[PDB]
Amino acid sequence: DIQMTQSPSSLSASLGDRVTITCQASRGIGKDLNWYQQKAGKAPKLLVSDASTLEGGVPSRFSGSGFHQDFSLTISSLQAEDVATYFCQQYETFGQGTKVDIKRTVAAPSVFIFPPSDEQLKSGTASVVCLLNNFYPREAKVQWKVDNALQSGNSQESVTEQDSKDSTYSLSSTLTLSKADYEKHKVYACEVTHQGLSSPVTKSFNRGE
Amino acid sequence: VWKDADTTLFCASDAKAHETEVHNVWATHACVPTDPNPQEIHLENVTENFNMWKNNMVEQMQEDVISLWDQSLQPCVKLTGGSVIKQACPKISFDPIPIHYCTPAGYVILKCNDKNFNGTGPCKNVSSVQCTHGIKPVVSTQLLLNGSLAEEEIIIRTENITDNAKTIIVHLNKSVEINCTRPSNGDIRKAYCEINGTKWNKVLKQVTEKLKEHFNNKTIIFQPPSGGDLEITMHHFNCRGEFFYCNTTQLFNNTCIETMKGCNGTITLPCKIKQIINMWQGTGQAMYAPPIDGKINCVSNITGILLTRDGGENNSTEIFRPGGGNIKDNWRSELYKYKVVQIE
Amino acid sequence: QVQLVQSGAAVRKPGASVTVSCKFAEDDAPEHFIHFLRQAPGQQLEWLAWMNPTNGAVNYAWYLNGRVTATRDRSMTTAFLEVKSLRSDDTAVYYCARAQKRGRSEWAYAHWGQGTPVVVSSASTKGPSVFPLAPSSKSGTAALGCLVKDYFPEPVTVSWNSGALTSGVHTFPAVLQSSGLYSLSSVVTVPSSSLGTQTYICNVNHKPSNTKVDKKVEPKSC
Numbered sequence A: 001d002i003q004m005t006q007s008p009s010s011l012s013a014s015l016g017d018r019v020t021i022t023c024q025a026s027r028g029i030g031k032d033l034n035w036y037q038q039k040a041g042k043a044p045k046l047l048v049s050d051a052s053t054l055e056g057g058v059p060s061r062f063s064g065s066g067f068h069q070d071f072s073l074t075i076s077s078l079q080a081e082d083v084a085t086y087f088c089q090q091y092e093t094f095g096q097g098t099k100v101d102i103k104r105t106v107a108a109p110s111v112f113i114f115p116p117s118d119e120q121l122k123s124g125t126a127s128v129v130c131l132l133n134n135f136y137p138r139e140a141k142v143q144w145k146v147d148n149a150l151q152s153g154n155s156q157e158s159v160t161e162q163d164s165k166d167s168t169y170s171l172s173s174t175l176t177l178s179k180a181d182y183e184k185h186k187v188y189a190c191e192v193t194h195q196g197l198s199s200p201v202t203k204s205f206n207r208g209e
Numbered sequence B: 001v002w003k004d005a006d007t008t009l010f011c012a013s014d015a016k017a018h019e020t021e022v023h024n025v026w027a028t029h030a031c032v033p034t035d036p037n038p039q040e041i042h043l044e045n046v047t048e049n050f051n052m053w054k055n056n057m058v059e060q061m062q063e064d065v066i067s068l069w070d071q072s073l074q075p076c077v078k079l080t081g082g083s084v085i086k087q088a089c090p091k092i093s094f095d096p097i098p099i100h101y102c103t104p105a106g107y108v109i110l111k112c113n114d115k116n117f118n119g120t121g122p123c124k125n126v127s128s129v130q131c132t133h134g135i136k137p138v139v140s141t142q143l144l145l146n147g148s149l150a151e152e153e154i155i156i157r158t159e160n161i162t163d164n165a166k167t168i169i170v171h172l173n174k175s176v177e178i179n180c181t182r183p184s185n186g187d188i189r190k191a192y193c194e195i196n197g198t199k200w201n202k203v204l205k206q207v208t209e210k211l212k213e214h215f216n217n218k219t220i221i222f223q224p225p226s227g228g229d230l231e232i233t234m235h236h237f238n239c240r241g242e243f244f245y246c247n248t249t250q251l252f253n254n255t256c257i258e259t260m261k262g263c264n265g266t267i268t269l270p271c272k273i274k275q276i277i278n279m280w281q282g283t284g285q286a287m288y289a290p291p292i293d294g295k296i297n298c299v300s301n302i303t304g305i306l307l308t309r310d311g312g313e314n315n316s317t318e319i320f321r322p323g324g325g326n327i328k329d330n331w332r333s334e335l336y337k338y339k340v341v342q343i344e
Numbered sequence C: 001q002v003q004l005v006q007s008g009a010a011v012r013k014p015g016a017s018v019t020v021s022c023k024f025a026e027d028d029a030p031e032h033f034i035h036f037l038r039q040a041p042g043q044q045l046e047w048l049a050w051m052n053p054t055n056g057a058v059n060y061a062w063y064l065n066g067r068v069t070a071t072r073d074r075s076m077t078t079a080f081l082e083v084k085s086l087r088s089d090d091t092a093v094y095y096c097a098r099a100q101k102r103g104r105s106e107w108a109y110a111h112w113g114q115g116t117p118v119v120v121s122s123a124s125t126k127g128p129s130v131f132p133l134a135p136s137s138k139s140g141t142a143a144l145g146c147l148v149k150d151y152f153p154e155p156v157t158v159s160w161n162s163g164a165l166t167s168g169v170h171t172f173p174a175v176l177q178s179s180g181l182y183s184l185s186s187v188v189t190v191p192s193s194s195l196g197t198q199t200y201i202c203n204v205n206h207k208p209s210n211t212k213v214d215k216k217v218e219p220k221s222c
């Protein structure tokens, strides 16, 4: 019957900066709160047990504290290895988690558009791919226009983890149409909106050129 | 003045040195005679903190019962991870006697006297004694047998009531008899336990009332165990040296907690005497000879219940299932009101 | 803080069952319980059950409705989680976890298995089609890649030049298509001057269907 309210759900900081995520328990829970770190693709790792106790084999920069109804996990000087998701645990109840990544100077995406292969067209389907390369922050908006007509519902996208070295994200967006529908239009374009872009960038092509 | 401390206790009992019954034999060489004139002193305006869940007296009693069973029980075969040990397996005489735990010089036992003390926290009515009361080392699951009763109201004990991995001990304030019988010359392993249903259902209803106090006011539901070895999915205990396993499905029955016909009256639990058991010491499997002939009968007082509560977020109801398996909890149910301190 | 060893990835039709195993000790004295959890794609960790290896006592999240059973082998070195009547939303990474022996809370999970992917779907095993993402004839650095389309189940591995070309490569997480099949893209940026001289091949490997492809990605000729 207890509720764990964690915050913030996301945050960015520079190398060496201080980071603090907090948990709020709907009821008094003493020190029965554990903290975990989870890196992409891997099992979670226990960082702090019983609220304050730093687990063994865990960097000194990690620190947890609190009692009763208020808790927080802190990282003295954020390092590159600390890019992961962090969450609290109260018995079988988990906090919502907090994604943290390295903060860097805004970087505009390098945008590319690829038309469908002649091979795939024979298969009856047409995939148009739009690549956004090496940008930050991760937040970008990809918009498909077919004959200058905004598309929605026939597109999926995928994003890499933050690259360790340059701290940037890459994103891939795919527009999938039937062959017949694809041959019914000329101009295929993806419009990209990002913070590092003074004005939305549009890459495009005409079918059959 | 004193401070919390651990030390080596010794046990005392009224064992008969001429008896062949195995508890008497153990206590005769392992304990000293009981103190004829035990002294209890009430400490005025003393408030002290007790914690039944972290009380080293429990580990010490556990060592004693393990060694009592190791030298008393005579299985035909013990199987331990690979080694098979075969030996003579004559039937024994078996009936637990009360054991007292006692501090050596320089130490004393503090005793909590608050009627509704739940096992942890401040006690306001404290006294010091040289020895605990007499505690029968009864090994059982699901139901605590032949123990002491809570003084006033039914008590619920847990280290953390909201931790589903923690056992819950229900301390009854009125005993319910359970009368178990393997009748004399059907199948020789088949037995039954009889319980006064009228009396048991009233008590279970009071337990739910008390459980409700700890979980808002949610609906309280009993269910049979979700799984595990037969020693824990059934009410397991030794009677006259035989290992009984009794099905308790009928005992934790929720319709009887309104007037549906047949709630009152005698409840008959089906039981089996097993020759092949898992040893509660935790040392593997053991095999015994078939049961002795004739009537095999054990009348015991139910004085407590071991429960486990279902995990997972639930806002409507709480589900409890009979539990046990960690025999240390049996001792905790009796040692909860004692702690050892060192005299400064 | 040793890792526990879980069984391999499993694929199942809805209605079927799966058994995940978790080795948590060598076969050579209070024992913490083995816990089982799962994490669905882009979801929070979910607790399923604990199992006491000493006597097999168990506790199951009520909402699993008895579909889940935990057991252990005779030597008490390996725990098993069986999930019956699988539905697609049982699809998740399943973990076993355990407290460190000297700790006194059952819930501080110091030891974790590596995780076992369980995929529940009515889709059939199928190898990918691999299409080129040609370097645009619009000329510093140019981008090219391979579209690995319509496979099941996951995963597929992608190399470039037999694994020789690693720098500048971004292989994106697969996406589940409404058809029930996955697709991912792998791209590489390279010097444009290289396009005329350098061969670029993406090596795709889909073990489940025993499918391998070496797709040469060339500039499209008009």
Ligand SMILES: *[C@@H]1O[C@H](CO)[C@@H](O)[C@H](O)[C@H]1NC(C)=O
Pocket (backbone or CB within 6 Å): A028, A029, A030, A031, A032, B159, B160, B162
């Ligand atoms: C568990 O028990 C401790 C005392 O031992 C208490 O402070 C704490 O509130 C409990 N934890 C809960 C309710 O989660």
Ligand SMILES: *[C@@H]1O[C@H](CO)[C@@H](O)[C@H](O)[C@H]1NC(C)=O
Pocket (backbone or CB within 6 Å): B113, B114, B125, B127
């Ligand atoms: C304290 O406890 C004892 C039982 O040991 C009882 O006889 C006595 O009346 C109680 N009263 C108080 C508060 O001293």
Ligand SMILES: *[C@@H]1O[C@H](CO)[C@@H](O)[C@H](O)[C@H]1NC(C)=O
Pocket (backbone or CB within 6 Å): B118, B119, B120, B121, B122, B156, B157, B158, B160, B161, B214
């Ligand atoms: C017992 O009493 C103490 C102090 O009043 C309290 O903190 C603890 O939660 C209680 N235990 C239960 C589960 O009744």
Ligand SMILES: *[C@@H]1O[C@H](CO)[C@@H](O)[C@H](O)[C@H]1NC(C)=O
Pocket (backbone or CB within 6 Å): B152, B153, B154, B173, B174, B206, B210
């Ligand atoms: C036992 O405890 C309950 C309250 O939990 C109380 O109502 C009942 O009267 C008690 N029984 C006796 C005989 O003291």
Ligand SMILES: *[C@@H]1O[C@H](CO)[C@@H](O)[C@H](O)[C@H]1NC(C)=O
Pocket (backbone or CB within 6 Å): B179, B180, B181, B194, B299
């Ligand atoms: C126990 O049950 C047996 C069989 O019904 C009966 O003969 C005996 O009288 C009972 N003992 C007591 C004390 O009720």
Ligand SMILES: *[C@@H]1O[C@H](CO)[C@@H](O)[C@H](O)[C@H]1NC(C)=O
Pocket (backbone or CB within 6 Å): B196, B197, B198, B199, B200, B202
């Ligand atoms: C069963 O228990 C009730 C007390 O709750 C008692 O009134 C009744 O007489 C008992 N039945 C017997 C002793 O046969």
Ligand SMILES: *[C@@H]1O[C@H](CO)[C@@H](O)[C@H](O)[C@H]1NC(C)=O
Pocket (backbone or CB within 6 Å): B233, B234, B247, B248, B249
């Ligand atoms: C106890 O008896 C009930 C009713 O027959 C049965 O369904 C259940 O499986 C039994 N329990 C065990 C552990 O055998």
Ligand SMILES: *[C@@H]1O[C@H](CO)[C@@H](O)[C@H](O)[C@H]1NC(C)=O
Pocket (backbone or CB within 6 Å): B249, B250, B251, B253, B254, B255, B256, B260, B261, B262, B263
């Ligand atoms: C519980 O009691 C009700 C009412 O008498 C009865 O119908 C039902 O069979 C009982 N359940 C069990 C399994 O004993």
Ligand SMILES: *[C@@H]1O[C@H](CO)[C@@H](O)[C@H](O)[C@H]1NC(C)=O
Pocket (backbone or CB within 6 Å): B096, B138, B145, B146, B237, B238, B239, B240, B297, B298, B299, B300, B301
């Ligand atoms: C409980 O005590 C009674 C009375 O001495 C005894 O006859 C019975 O066998 C005991 N039960 C157990 C399980 O030891």
Ligand SMILES: [Cl-]
Pocket (backbone or CB within 6 Å): B273, B274, B275, B276, B277
């Ligand atoms: Cl048997």
Ligand SMILES: [Cl-]
Pocket (backbone or CB within 6 Å): C030, C031, C032, C033
């Ligand atoms: Cl434990």
Ligand SMILES: [Cl-]
Pocket (backbone or CB within 6 Å): C031, C032, C033, C106
């Ligand atoms: Cl435990």
Ligand code: NA
Pocket (backbone or CB within 6 Å): B091, B092, B093, B240, B241, B242, B292
């Ligand atoms: Na016997």
Ligand code: NA
Pocket (backbone or CB within 6 Å): B224, B225, B233, B247, B248, B249, B250
């Ligand atoms: Na049952």
Ligand code: NA
Pocket (backbone or CB within 6 Å): B229, B278, B279, B282, C054, C055
């Ligand atoms: Na066992």
Ligand code: NA
Pocket (backbone or CB within 6 Å): B226, B310, B311, C059, C060, C061, C062
């Ligand atoms: Na359950």
